[PDB]
Amino acid sequence: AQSVPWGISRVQAPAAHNRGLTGSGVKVAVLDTGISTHPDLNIRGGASFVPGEPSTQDGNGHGTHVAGTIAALNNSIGVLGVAPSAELYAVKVLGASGSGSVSSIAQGLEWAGNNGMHVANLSLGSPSPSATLEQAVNSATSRGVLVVAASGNSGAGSISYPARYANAMAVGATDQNNNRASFSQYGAGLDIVAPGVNVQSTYPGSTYASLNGTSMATPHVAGAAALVKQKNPSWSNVQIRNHLKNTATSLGSTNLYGSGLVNAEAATR
Ligand SMILES: *S(=O)(=O)Cc1ccc(C=C)cc1
Ligand SMILES: [Ca+2]
Ligand SMILES: [Cl-]
């Protein structure tokens, strides 16, 4: 049996699926700890930039979890992604510990821009800026990648990097009441929010697990971007980003929520 995690329903992905929109034909890179082989995922390719971890399999769990929020397969098992037919790429930039470097992350962004990705999900970041990282965000953006990044989990009213950069689409986290999760960073540069509490997804060991974080919110938006790109193949990264924001549901101040809660139904209508 398949179930639909609450956040997938909250962003109204099923309404898009019912119009034939699944993310088919859209390439989405998950820049994270890898993605493990899993019967509810279809991994098309990828690359590793973590020295000593040359495989793209996931020794941590987070990247597999993020991948399933984007793209868990629509079938009779497991869960269901926002964009269940997205073409899914494992771009390992963080090791099994959950950390990498700005260089590995930048290499993953450059890979995305050199390999035809439409969306790059970066459920990662730091409170400090990075010139290396910034250059790579801008380069990927110039190559047509929509960079979608987590705002961070410190609870502060400023957002972390790379989400803070103008050419990243910064995503904060909401709870089941459509309030900002206490940990979700907010403030200048915040673009949008999505579910990030008690998010069930695919997990290594061919299982399913729940996590909290802006890392869980981000892939809802990356998946919604893929739905919008399938509907509107000619659109740029900027057009997709703007449309997601323009069709989001206001939840409160722009400082706290950006444009508000992503709405895949309104974005694909
Ligand atoms: S996540 O699991 O919520 C991990 C994570 C995401 C983002 C940052 C900073 C932007 C840090 C950790
Ligand atoms: Ca499934
Ligand atoms: Cl729906």
Side-chain angles (χ1 to χ4, degrees), residues 15 24 27 36 41 76 88 97 115 148 178 181 185 214 222 240-241 249 256-257 266:
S24 186
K27 296 190 188 295
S36 293
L41 297 174
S76 298
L88 176 67
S97 70
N115 291 87
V148 186
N178 297 326
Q185 288 173 238
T214 61
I240 296 164
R241 177 174 177 178
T249 298
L256 288 166
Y257 299 107

PDB file of all heavy atoms in Angstrom, residues 15 24 27 36 41 76 88 97 115 148 178 181 185 214 222 240-241 249 256-257 266:
ATOM      1  N   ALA A  15      -3.456  17.210  -6.704  1.00  0.00           N
ATOM      2  CA  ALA A  15      -4.247  17.915  -7.724  1.00  0.00           C
ATOM      3  C   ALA A  15      -3.469  18.082  -9.004  1.00  0.00           C
ATOM      4  O   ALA A  15      -4.038  18.028 -10.105  1.00  0.00           O
ATOM      5  CB  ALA A  15      -4.711  19.236  -7.205  1.00  0.00           C
ATOM      6  N   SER A  24       7.568  14.606 -15.188  1.00  0.00           N
ATOM      7  CA  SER A  24       8.155  13.896 -16.310  1.00  0.00           C
ATOM      8  C   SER A  24       8.973  14.874 -17.157  1.00  0.00           C
ATOM      9  O   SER A  24       8.552  16.006 -17.421  1.00  0.00           O
ATOM     10  CB  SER A  24       7.051  13.302 -17.150  1.00  0.00           C
ATOM     11  OG  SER A  24       7.589  12.481 -18.180  1.00  0.00           O
ATOM     12  N   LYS A  27      14.730  17.293 -15.005  1.00  0.00           N
ATOM     13  CA  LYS A  27      15.896  16.779 -14.306  1.00  0.00           C
ATOM     14  C   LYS A  27      16.099  17.534 -13.009  1.00  0.00           C
ATOM     15  O   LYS A  27      16.252  18.769 -13.015  1.00  0.00           O
ATOM     16  CB  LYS A  27      17.134  16.873 -15.198  1.00  0.00           C
ATOM     17  CG  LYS A  27      17.036  16.001 -16.430  1.00  0.00           C
ATOM     18  CD  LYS A  27      18.370  15.931 -17.163  1.00  0.00           C
ATOM     19  CE  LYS A  27      18.254  15.225 -18.486  1.00  0.00           C
ATOM     20  NZ  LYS A  27      17.903  13.838 -18.314  1.00  0.00           N
ATOM     21  N   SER A  36      20.279   6.454  -1.813  1.00  0.00           N
ATOM     22  CA  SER A  36      20.376   5.002  -1.854  1.00  0.00           C
ATOM     23  C   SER A  36      19.328   4.390  -2.753  1.00  0.00           C
ATOM     24  O   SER A  36      18.176   4.806  -2.801  1.00  0.00           O
ATOM     25  CB  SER A  36      20.302   4.414  -0.480  1.00  0.00           C
ATOM     26  OG  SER A  36      21.459   4.799   0.257  1.00  0.00           O
ATOM     27  N   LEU A  41      12.220   4.686  -5.368  1.00  0.00           N
ATOM     28  CA  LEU A  41      12.965   5.731  -6.065  1.00  0.00           C
ATOM     29  C   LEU A  41      13.462   5.202  -7.395  1.00  0.00           C
ATOM     30  O   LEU A  41      13.837   4.029  -7.524  1.00  0.00           O
ATOM     31  CB  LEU A  41      14.167   6.218  -5.258  1.00  0.00           C
ATOM     32  CG  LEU A  41      13.847   6.876  -3.927  1.00  0.00           C
ATOM     33  CD1 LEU A  41      15.127   7.175  -3.154  1.00  0.00           C
ATOM     34  CD2 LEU A  41      13.052   8.162  -4.094  1.00  0.00           C
ATOM     35  N   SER A  76       2.231   1.148  -5.754  1.00  0.00           N
ATOM     36  CA  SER A  76       1.457   0.537  -4.663  1.00  0.00           C
ATOM     37  C   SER A  76       2.241   0.336  -3.392  1.00  0.00           C
ATOM     38  O   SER A  76       1.787  -0.414  -2.520  1.00  0.00           O
ATOM     39  CB  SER A  76       0.814  -0.758  -5.116  1.00  0.00           C
ATOM     40  OG  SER A  76      -0.104  -0.558  -6.179  1.00  0.00           O
ATOM     41  N   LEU A  88      15.693  11.866 -11.550  1.00  0.00           N
ATOM     42  CA  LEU A  88      16.263  12.119 -10.271  1.00  0.00           C
ATOM     43  C   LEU A  88      17.790  11.829 -10.288  1.00  0.00           C
ATOM     44  O   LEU A  88      18.175  10.713 -10.655  1.00  0.00           O
ATOM     45  CB  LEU A  88      15.535  11.205  -9.291  1.00  0.00           C
ATOM     46  CG  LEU A  88      16.087  11.247  -7.842  1.00  0.00           C
ATOM     47  CD1 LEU A  88      15.863  12.584  -7.171  1.00  0.00           C
ATOM     48  CD2 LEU A  88      15.495  10.101  -7.040  1.00  0.00           C
ATOM     49  N   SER A  97      28.721  11.498   7.323  1.00  0.00           N
ATOM     50  CA  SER A  97      28.575  12.288   8.502  1.00  0.00           C
ATOM     51  C   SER A  97      27.560  13.386   8.415  1.00  0.00           C
ATOM     52  O   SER A  97      27.181  13.975   9.424  1.00  0.00           O
ATOM     53  CB  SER A  97      29.999  13.025   8.872  1.00  0.00           C
ATOM     54  OG  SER A  97      30.191  14.045   7.843  1.00  0.00           O
ATOM     55  N   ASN A 115      25.262  19.355 -16.780  1.00  0.00           N
ATOM     56  CA  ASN A 115      24.584  18.095 -17.073  1.00  0.00           C
ATOM     57  C   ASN A 115      23.086  18.263 -17.269  1.00  0.00           C
ATOM     58  O   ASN A 115      22.342  17.300 -17.253  1.00  0.00           O
ATOM     59  CB  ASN A 115      24.905  17.039 -16.014  1.00  0.00           C
ATOM     60  CG  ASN A 115      26.358  16.602 -16.105  1.00  0.00           C
ATOM     61  OD1 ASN A 115      27.261  17.239 -15.498  1.00  0.00           O
ATOM     62  ND2 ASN A 115      26.599  15.581 -16.869  1.00  0.00           N
ATOM     63  N   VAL A 148      17.333  25.651  -5.344  1.00  0.00           N
ATOM     64  CA  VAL A 148      16.349  25.715  -4.276  1.00  0.00           C
ATOM     65  C   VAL A 148      17.068  25.296  -3.005  1.00  0.00           C
ATOM     66  O   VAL A 148      17.645  24.198  -2.974  1.00  0.00           O
ATOM     67  CB  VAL A 148      15.138  24.809  -4.574  1.00  0.00           C
ATOM     68  CG1 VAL A 148      14.062  24.993  -3.524  1.00  0.00           C
ATOM     69  CG2 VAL A 148      14.574  25.085  -5.956  1.00  0.00           C
ATOM     70  N   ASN A 178       0.122  25.435   9.644  1.00  0.00           N
ATOM     71  CA  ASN A 178       0.564  26.517   8.768  1.00  0.00           C
ATOM     72  C   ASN A 178       1.178  27.677   9.557  1.00  0.00           C
ATOM     73  O   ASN A 178       1.096  28.827   9.145  1.00  0.00           O
ATOM     74  CB  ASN A 178      -0.488  26.977   7.788  1.00  0.00           C
ATOM     75  CG  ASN A 178      -0.876  25.893   6.820  1.00  0.00           C
ATOM     76  OD1 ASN A 178      -0.052  25.066   6.420  1.00  0.00           O
ATOM     77  ND2 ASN A 178      -2.144  25.840   6.480  1.00  0.00           N
ATOM     78  N   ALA A 181       7.727  26.714  11.592  1.00  0.00           N
ATOM     79  CA  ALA A 181       8.333  25.847  12.589  1.00  0.00           C
ATOM     80  C   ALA A 181       9.306  26.685  13.406  1.00  0.00           C
ATOM     81  O   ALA A 181       9.997  27.558  12.865  1.00  0.00           O
ATOM     82  CB  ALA A 181       9.057  24.710  11.911  1.00  0.00           C
ATOM     83  N   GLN A 185      14.593  29.317   9.883  1.00  0.00           N
ATOM     84  CA  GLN A 185      15.126  30.662   9.718  1.00  0.00           C
ATOM     85  C   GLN A 185      14.274  31.467   8.761  1.00  0.00           C
ATOM     86  O   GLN A 185      13.666  30.935   7.809  1.00  0.00           O
ATOM     87  CB  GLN A 185      16.580  30.606   9.292  1.00  0.00           C
ATOM     88  CG  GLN A 185      17.464  30.153  10.453  1.00  0.00           C
ATOM     89  CD  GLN A 185      18.899  29.904  10.096  1.00  0.00           C
ATOM     90  OE1 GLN A 185      19.415  28.803  10.300  1.00  0.00           O
ATOM     91  NE2 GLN A 185      19.575  30.921   9.577  1.00  0.00           N
ATOM     92  N   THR A 214      14.261  22.458   7.780  1.00  0.00           N
ATOM     93  CA  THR A 214      14.136  23.154   6.506  1.00  0.00           C
ATOM     94  C   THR A 214      14.650  22.306   5.359  1.00  0.00           C
ATOM     95  O   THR A 214      14.246  22.508   4.204  1.00  0.00           O
ATOM     96  CB  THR A 214      14.762  24.547   6.546  1.00  0.00           C
ATOM     97  OG1 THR A 214      16.161  24.472   6.831  1.00  0.00           O
ATOM     98  CG2 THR A 214      14.057  25.480   7.510  1.00  0.00           C
ATOM     99  N   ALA A 222      11.285  22.094  -4.578  1.00  0.00           N
ATOM    100  CA  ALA A 222      11.981  21.571  -5.749  1.00  0.00           C
ATOM    101  C   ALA A 222      11.037  20.719  -6.603  1.00  0.00           C
ATOM    102  O   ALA A 222      11.021  20.799  -7.832  1.00  0.00           O
ATOM    103  CB  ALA A 222      13.190  20.757  -5.318  1.00  0.00           C
ATOM    104  N   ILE A 240       9.854  30.119 -13.305  1.00  0.00           N
ATOM    105  CA  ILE A 240       9.319  29.100 -12.418  1.00  0.00           C
ATOM    106  C   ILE A 240       9.289  29.613 -10.977  1.00  0.00           C
ATOM    107  O   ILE A 240       8.277  29.488 -10.271  1.00  0.00           O
ATOM    108  CB  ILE A 240      10.121  27.812 -12.537  1.00  0.00           C
ATOM    109  CG1 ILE A 240      10.018  27.205 -13.935  1.00  0.00           C
ATOM    110  CG2 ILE A 240       9.688  26.804 -11.479  1.00  0.00           C
ATOM    111  CD1 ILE A 240      11.083  26.168 -14.225  1.00  0.00           C
ATOM    112  N   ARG A 241      10.422  30.165 -10.528  1.00  0.00           N
ATOM    113  CA  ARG A 241      10.533  30.696  -9.173  1.00  0.00           C
ATOM    114  C   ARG A 241       9.455  31.742  -8.914  1.00  0.00           C
ATOM    115  O   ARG A 241       8.756  31.712  -7.890  1.00  0.00           O
ATOM    116  CB  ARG A 241      11.925  31.280  -9.022  1.00  0.00           C
ATOM    117  CG  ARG A 241      12.214  31.957  -7.699  1.00  0.00           C
ATOM    118  CD  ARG A 241      13.655  32.365  -7.635  1.00  0.00           C
ATOM    119  NE  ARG A 241      13.960  33.080  -6.417  1.00  0.00           N
ATOM    120  CZ  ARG A 241      15.187  33.505  -6.122  1.00  0.00           C
ATOM    121  NH1 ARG A 241      16.225  33.149  -6.867  1.00  0.00           N
ATOM    122  NH2 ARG A 241      15.360  34.298  -5.072  1.00  0.00           N
ATOM    123  N   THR A 249       0.218  30.525  -1.042  1.00  0.00           N
ATOM    124  CA  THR A 249      -0.796  31.040  -0.132  1.00  0.00           C
ATOM    125  C   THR A 249      -0.163  31.872   0.962  1.00  0.00           C
ATOM    126  O   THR A 249       0.680  31.378   1.719  1.00  0.00           O
ATOM    127  CB  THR A 249      -1.552  29.884   0.519  1.00  0.00           C
ATOM    128  OG1 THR A 249      -2.213  29.127  -0.501  1.00  0.00           O
ATOM    129  CG2 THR A 249      -2.596  30.403   1.493  1.00  0.00           C
ATOM    130  N   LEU A 256       8.557  36.618   7.724  1.00  0.00           N
ATOM    131  CA  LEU A 256       8.482  35.282   8.349  1.00  0.00           C
ATOM    132  C   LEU A 256       8.308  34.067   7.388  1.00  0.00           C
ATOM    133  O   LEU A 256       8.784  32.966   7.674  1.00  0.00           O
ATOM    134  CB  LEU A 256       7.328  35.279   9.348  1.00  0.00           C
ATOM    135  CG  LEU A 256       7.564  36.079  10.637  1.00  0.00           C
ATOM    136  CD1 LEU A 256       6.234  36.275  11.366  1.00  0.00           C
ATOM    137  CD2 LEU A 256       8.507  35.404  11.551  1.00  0.00           C
ATOM    138  N   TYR A 257       7.575  34.270   6.298  1.00  0.00           N
ATOM    139  CA  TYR A 257       7.101  33.242   5.365  1.00  0.00           C
ATOM    140  C   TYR A 257       7.461  33.493   3.919  1.00  0.00           C
ATOM    141  O   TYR A 257       7.151  32.658   3.054  1.00  0.00           O
ATOM    142  CB  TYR A 257       5.559  33.127   5.443  1.00  0.00           C
ATOM    143  CG  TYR A 257       5.047  32.729   6.794  1.00  0.00           C
ATOM    144  CD1 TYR A 257       4.418  33.587   7.640  1.00  0.00           C
ATOM    145  CD2 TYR A 257       5.216  31.439   7.241  1.00  0.00           C
ATOM    146  CE1 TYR A 257       3.968  33.129   8.911  1.00  0.00           C
ATOM    147  CE2 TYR A 257       4.780  30.992   8.454  1.00  0.00           C
ATOM    148  CZ  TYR A 257       4.164  31.848   9.288  1.00  0.00           C
ATOM    149  OH  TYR A 257       3.779  31.393  10.531  1.00  0.00           O
ATOM    150  N   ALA A 266      -2.303  25.590  -7.441  1.00  0.00           N
ATOM    151  CA  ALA A 266      -2.428  26.933  -7.985  1.00  0.00           C
ATOM    152  C   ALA A 266      -1.313  27.195  -9.007  1.00  0.00           C
ATOM    153  O   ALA A 266      -1.544  27.953  -9.957  1.00  0.00           O
ATOM    154  CB  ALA A 266      -2.414  27.960  -6.885  1.00  0.00           C
TER     155      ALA A 266
END
